[PDB]
């Protein structure tokens, strides 16, 4: 390439220039070498990237040139070679000649700097080439970076004022190139020319980089508010002001900026709609964020500023909501605690934008992601959003989201509400959760329960945090809040059952302090039944009824424990009933009546019209079956009116004693045995004998009278005999004989 | 060895009468500690089964009441550490707690280890009539049916001996408690 | 095409023939023109359709020819011209003029007719061409039609045998050209030439027509029947046999067929197999029907003909059985009288011919259709059923009948019996209908009630239609027949319940003449309870056993009404038992214990020692029901165990009043009171209190010695206060108030 | 009106305890006459139900003591034509036809019309305490199941009146009867 050839040539040129400078006394040929080397620098045959590489090469060589400057040139002088070689109409050769002279002079003495610098700037009127102008002024800045005066400003040519003047004029003229550079040349070159612009922005920002160590806030604002802002209003280039305000943000102590960024915003509210105003704004907001929450109602001022802006702009969904959520985070930075204004942003800034945004359903628009981020920003932000949860204009904003956004926010909210555990709640949470649920499955395999099941669980569980008196009213809230329709409450109810039923105990903790606890307990029974049918209202589902059956059973034993057991009686009956509805599976009822028996067996406080009655009723239940062994099982399980069983029977219905019905249930057992005699199977009969002798010795050792040792000895011998005498082998037989000899040991 | 810590975790009742294990003891259930987990059914909710699978290297269950769809999963499961026939259950099938009727059913299933978590929900253990009695109460620490502490036990079963490290979270402020019990089977 | 030219030539020939006929004396020229006329058709180029059209044209032409002939020429004669043109070489005009002059002679000369005809027939032998021969002979016969030498000629020139010769020669020549018509013209034209044969066969049958104009049975059977059957068996041609014989049969009257059947049937039975002998013998049987249906074992002889042609031919089973359908119809036209003959040949012989014919699968097989038609033939032909009911062997035929036809015919015969009263069933009748049944239900949507719902209803009812005494053994035979299987009589046992129950009192009604009514009554009771337990033993009824309950109840109630307390006490104990075994559904349990109540209620004379024990058991089991409101319902009906109610409790020692133990009545009244105080439902309890009020006030008006007006006042004031103080608004509340008003009016 | 052919009839204990109605009523009770048939239930088969639905599109079917399968059809029902309220049911509650219980249940029903199945098939009629007492009977008076008249009456209900046309099929030789004994509600 031309780049390679030019680099090789200028490399040999700087090689001989080193031969000149390292061996002193050759100042004339060295100056001529520098002049002819910059003669190739006016040759712009190097593409701006190639030109950039060659300029970096000559710039690192030129740092050594400036070292040789500081080492040799401070001796006496260099006299007006610029005007002496001025004979040609050209400018750049003698230009850089006297420029090297001025770099020497600034290397020695700080006084002559401003004189020769204004000389260069004035005689630069002949340089119509803006690219060479920018390259030159950048060279001067990077050079005079170590030579531009500072707070030691004392009055010689070159001071803070004069250095900022020099750097500012070089900056703005390099800006003038940086603009034309996008457009100088052929019109079709605009793409590569924007490339040049982007490549050389930092070469101009170096001016501000040097401005970093410079004028304080008053001087700052005065010296900067005018000139560069007018440069901005004149260029109207996006990348220009973008990079500019970027370097500004990072350049001065922002006690300067933010005390000016207010009126700076007031000035720069002028931006065109096709200019990337939002990037500017969000970079500002970045400064303001790591300003504030890094551990002038900027709300008012800056919010109204951006109000004007979006009002002056025409921000579609995307830019609008991007700036919206950025504003959200920004308020979360500056005024977390000035919440009033934050919920103002919510309602009369952000909700008014929301509806004011007359944009149809939009998810491909990432602006919805921005709004979701926005909504969760104080969620994601507070450790205590329950504080903001006390705001509806926090939550009442939610209708303004669409079904997909709705359950998005649903997943987010449930996350919020699952990680935490609920404290003392006024009805307020109940408002919040009305919202939640009416968003939840309202309006109209659940692959992820999404997430309502694990949700509802922890929902009703945190609900237990509530206290008794209002717990019933909010139980109302819950229950009918579950007026959604059918195929959900299977995923719901037992929790709810339990909620009511343990509220029974919480309430009952005041029975020594109440009589209306009878009436409030009524209120319970009512609401119980309310839910109960509410689910019985839902018969359509498989395997879910049996559940509510058991649930009814639980409420029953509850009231049993609530000592106001007047009605659990009725629960138990209607439980049998809804069984008789729910009769479809064998093993189902098997376990079902098993549970019936367990529960009732754990019931010992009812009166005979309940007590003995229900005994007979469950006896019936048992009797009402189809297949033998399991039946017999439950049968002899149900044996509990008269004698010793079980230890848990600490009951004063029989003087701390046990009730193991002996004789009647015994004849029922004999009934079952003869019925089983109709089976004609070996292992079944084996079992039969097993449980037979089990309960036989169970009576004899527990002092049961009519179970005499004669029956038992004769029958165990009979079982052993017919077992051995007419029954074929199977491992069951031998394990049973083992069990049997064990029982013999246990006969005592 | 240190291979099979036999925790007695049960009385799940989730969401039946419970939802979650105390955080300390729940995270005490991180995988890699034991390859052996002893869940005893009526979990119930599907999420319980999912988190169990994610958390449990061992799947051996009994069949449970509140459990509508996986009614296929067995009534019980026999285990052997060293040489033992191990029986585990809830205690629902019998009307009472009678250790002799219990071991009756056990012989009907031929197991010499006898562990359960029934409907009175207590911890107590001893031997009567030559067999050992294992019930810890609500291993989930839930409220009982009676008038609880979550009780799982580092049951150290190899050969015929059992060492029991029960971890207990009881409130005075809650308090994590450990009691050490040792049992050797009469072989 | 040439046929049209022949037709126009014949038209012009008839034109010149008309011209020659209208001119007498030129009748010789007329005969010449007629010979030219017939020469146009003499060629075999005229297709038998157009040949016969030309033949009828020339035939009407020769009709006028022979008319004008018999007018002009037979004035004396033509002198022996028959022989003069009998030897000349030119044969055709010779023959045509000869037949014309023979026609003239037959017109004028009645005696020499047979000579001329026979000589023409003899000279017809020298030619072997059948076309010209047949058509020439048809012309001659059409001439000789009106003067056959026959039975009208009683011995002069012509007799029976003369017409015999005439017609038989004509007919055999007809048959000669007729069978040649199967081979006439082209060979590949078989179907067309046979169609032409069929077109011309009417000319053949014309001889049969002429024969029908002749002698009666005797001389026929003498001189013609023999020859008739002779030609019949001598044709030996499928088409000749078929067509000619069907013509014969259709033609000749039955005075001939009086004694000429059997040998004729035999002659037919041995003819060609390619004939549809089935159809023609069916037509014969249809003539036989024309005989029978009008109000020497031709029955059996004809069956023998049947068997012979079964052997002499190769009969498809289908054809056979269809013929048998027709035979059965004919025979049950013949001997419905002592049908034993008919059923002999049909079942005992013809049905056996079937079981011989081991037919392959046949429903779509027309053998099956002939089957069903034959089978129903007696059944539909029957006017009275014990004709069939006398047929005991169809039970095998039942097996010999195929499955769907089995069902069809069985439903047929049964409902035919059913449409009106059936009679007593003799043993054979019994087991026959039992066979019917054990084929139908046994062996093995109720759009058929498959199938016997009404059928078993009518069955069990007509069981009564039988003879009083045997009805018991009939019960036993039927309960044997009521072994259809554990899954068949499920709900149609209550019929046999009815049977036993009615027979109970029926046989009770014979005590004045045989004391075994008590012993055999007990024996019944045993057989009954057997059957009843059996349906209990149909435990496989889905809790549905309220029936068997009701049936035992009916029975025991009648037993006590038949005053058989012994097993009445026993069988009501059994009712107790099965009751508890069956006591199943709240609502049900209610109704059924009401049934048990009524079971008690209807008694009058039962022993009190058992009565009061039953009272105790009742009150117990009553108290052994479950649900509260319905329970107190049970309670108030339960006190009828004591009160001056029911029919059970009406003693004529009570001064026509009833048992009236109003004390325990009021006791249970207090019980139900307590219970209603605890149902935990306002309005139901209220209405129930009203009901109890009504009980008490009726007893007051019924004068219960235990009804205290203090209880009146206390309860009414309690209720009046509650309805005034605490009754919640509802319509049933208004019902309570108004009926309370009614009660107040009733207080007297 | 012949649009009100209100008839209490039937009750032949069928298919169990009869065979069928003879052609006399069959043609007398064939389609084309009755627009409103009054059913007494307990047929007990289905085909007769079909036939009776065929008799008129206006029936009132009831479950009876021999009616098991349709467990659903309750036993009582009331209808009203003008000011007449036609209540009807089994009567199972009755231990005897005591007018007190009769009128009492009627008041529970708020009716003056009488239809049931007792035990006997025995008719009587009279006035006592504002109500009249009419036995629904059977078709020709089948055997003993209803506290022996062939019960059928061309009955039009008007206001408080029912035109009771007392008709019987009496044996002497069953013969049709055309007679009338009409009752109107006292009110």
Numbering used by the authors:
A (entry chain A), C (entry chain C): 12 to 306, 387 to 535, 554 to 857
B (entry chain B), D (entry chain D): 0 to 146, 153 to 177, 181 to 195
Sentences copied from the publication:
Here, we elucidate the structural basis of membrane tubulation and coupled cargo recognition by metazoan and fungal retromer coats assembled with the non–Bin1/Amphiphysin/Rvs (BAR) sorting nexin SNX3 using cryo–electron tomography.
In the assembled retromer:SNX-BAR, the core trimer does not contact the membrane but is bound to the SNX-BAR adaptor layer via loops 5 and 9 of VPS26 (6). In retromer:PX-BAR coats, membrane bending will be enhanced through the well-established local membrane-remodeling action of the curved BAR domains. The core trimer arch—the conserved architectural element of the different retromer coats—forms a scaffold that can contribute directly or indirectly to membrane bending and which propagates curvature over larger areas of membrane by oligomerization.
